[PDB]
Design a protein around this ligand. Structure first.
Ligand code: B12
Ligand SMILES: C[C@@H]1O[C@@H](n2cnc3c(N)ncnc32)[C@H](O)[C@@H]1O
Length: 227
């Protein structure tokens, strides 16, 4: 049933530069404090949606031609919301829930922790400071980063599709690939992401099959307020 649902979501999103990964809500919830839990039974089927370098040309550029563009609204976020809504139309027999990466509660807290979802769905290994022995950074924020086995850091997590009522307690956990296994490279990756993310270099932590085009890089280098 998972393969049938996966095919329906893939037929909707994969031609537009997206990738889809199944997971159980339990895997996500067990790694997090109760504050960040999804209010669903553990065996509930969920899909992690990410965007590849192809989504800029296949989804965003054609979307910037639609009659959907709104004033003071981010075009990428509108584009992602639109395609996630198309998943809803592909499954009329099901009542589905969709949470995008950019969504926040009234208190400005993220609705989902996109990187924890990407890790448990086996999409991209989530590297944190707790994955570095003898943590050398001290009392400062060291934000974690997911590395995709094919695109390195040349991707983005865009959302989760939740299927309440679809329970898969026997869904096998598929561990994400530990593409950055040594301490030295994990330190270089975490420092590249936290202190030099503007030079795009951390995204090459794994040799990518494809990078963002120079046009896509020029678009994303522009602050959202100026897009
Ligand atoms: C708010 C936020 C920021 C803030 C704060 C920094 C941060 N990363 O939190 C600011 C504005 C500074 C920031 C900057 C950037 N952002 Co940002 N961050 C966002 C966002 C929206 C929320 C992250 C968050 O609130 N984390 C909260 C903390 C508490 O969570 P945590 O560290 O993971 O801790 C939890 C886990 O450790 C878990 N846990 C415990 N034990 C274990 C064990 C395992 C095995 C696992 C998996 C989990 C786990 O429990 C903890 C919670 O208690 C996420 C998207 C999202 N919705 O998640 C993007 C996001 C992480 N950022 C992204 C990026 C790329 C960036 C930038 C490079 C800028 C850009 N190009 O957009 C920069 C620079 C990098 C940086 N400094 O983080 C991408 C990262 C993609 C990736 N992983 O490759 C994300 C995922 C958005 C996306 N659409 O893809 N961002
Ligand atoms: C009036 C309040 O202000 C906004 N708001 C902005 N930041 C916060 C926060 N940290 N906690 C709660 N609400 C917040 C909400 O939108 C709410 O309506």
């Amino acid at each position: 049933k998972v393969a049938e649902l996966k095919q329906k979501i893939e037929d909707t999103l994969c031609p537009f530069g997206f990738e889809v990964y199944p997971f159980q809500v339990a895997w996500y919830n067990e790694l997090l404090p109760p504050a960040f839990h999804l209010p669903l039974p553990g065996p509930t089927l969920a899909f992690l949606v990410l965007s590849t370098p192809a989504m800029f040309d296949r989804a965003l550029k054609p979307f910037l031609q639609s009659c959907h563009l709104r004033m003071l609204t981010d075009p990428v976020d509108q584009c992602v919301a639109y395609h996630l809504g198309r998943v809803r139309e592909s499954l009329p027999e099901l009542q589905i829930e969709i949470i995008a990466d950019y969504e926040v509660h009234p208190n400005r807290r993220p609705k989902i922790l996109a990187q924890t979802a990407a890790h448990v769905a086996g999409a991209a290994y989530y590297y944190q400071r707790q994955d570095v022995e003898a943590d050398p950074w001290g009392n400062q924020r060291i934000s974690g980063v997911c590395i995709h086995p094919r695109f390195g850091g040349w991707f983005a997590i865009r959302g989760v599709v939740l299927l309440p009522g679809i329970e898969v307690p026997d869904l096998p956990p598929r561990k994400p690939h530990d593409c950055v296994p040594t301490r030295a490279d994990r330190i270089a990756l975490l420092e590249g992401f936290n202190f030099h993310w503007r030079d795009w270099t951390y995204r090459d932590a794994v040799t990518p099959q494809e990078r963002y085009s120079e046009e896509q890089k020029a678009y994303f280098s522009t602050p959202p307020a100026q897009r």
